[PDB]
Design a protein around this ligand. Structure first.
Ligand SMILES: Nc1ncnc2c1ncn2[C@@H]1O[C@H](COP(=O)(O)O)[C@@H](OP(=O)(O)O)[C@H]1O
Length: 195
């Protein structure tokens, strides 16, 4: 299928831990914003995609077998259609807790030089969900978060979708993917030192 797992949850829903877990389970290498922080030239792919280019997703994800997090979650419909055999994982969270975490981290802007273009490109990524509305407004952002959960559940067949909280750890994830439960601890990446 080329793609094993497409994570379509928003950032700050445990996506770094899910990345690590998919990697442990042999479903990786797993794309994540971390890959763009390691190689900022990858920003060009997402800048093109946000701008309406006919993206070659096999080139965007060359070298990777799964993806989680933004930016790819802002293209979730495209990717579910492009990779119909991939399993889809929607990570969820209390949406109020989610937004409060975002305001301290990835949405801080809404109140090295290799990342000069990062904020403008990711503004385009986020606004594929938020539109021109107020990202910083908790009531609005909760509505966007809840709409996305409904949209995913209405679009992806239930047998191909896992609605997942990372606090569940291995058992539900591994049952969904059809693999055994690892001995190693389930990841708990707080995803804080990038800030
Ligand atoms: N195994 C786990 N159990 C519970 N929460 C977890 C977890 N792994 C990660 N998280 C939480 O998921 C959030 C990070 O999500 P992401 O990797 O998408 O940025 C962090 O919470 P906070 O957002 O409250 O700090 C982190 O503590």
């Amino acid at each position: 299928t080329s793609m094993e797992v497409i994570g379509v949850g928003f950032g700050r829903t445990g996506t770094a831990s899910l990345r690590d877990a998919l990697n442990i389970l042999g479903m990786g290498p797993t794309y994540h914003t971390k890959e763009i922080l390691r190689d900022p030239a990858r920003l060009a792919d997402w800048q093109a995609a946000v701008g309406g280019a006919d993206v070659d997703w096999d080139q965007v994800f060359a070298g990777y077998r799964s993806t989680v997090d933004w930016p790819a979650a802002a293209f979730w419909r495209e990717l579910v259609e492009r990779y119909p055999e991939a399993k889809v994982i929607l990570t969820v969270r209390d949406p109020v807790q989610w937004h409060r975490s975002c305001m301290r981290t990835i949405f801080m802007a809404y109140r090295d030089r290799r990342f000069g273009a990062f904020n403008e490109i990711f503004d385009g990524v986020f606004r594929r969900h938020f539109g021109d509305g107020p990202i910083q407004d908790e009531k609005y952002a909760v509505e966007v978060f809840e709409k996305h959960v409904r949209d995913v559940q209405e679009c992806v067949p239930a047998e191909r979708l896992l609605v997942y909280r990372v606090s569940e750890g291995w058992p539900t994830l591994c049952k969904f993917l059809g693999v055994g439960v690892p001995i190693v601890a389930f990841p708990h990446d707080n995803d804080q030192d990038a800030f």
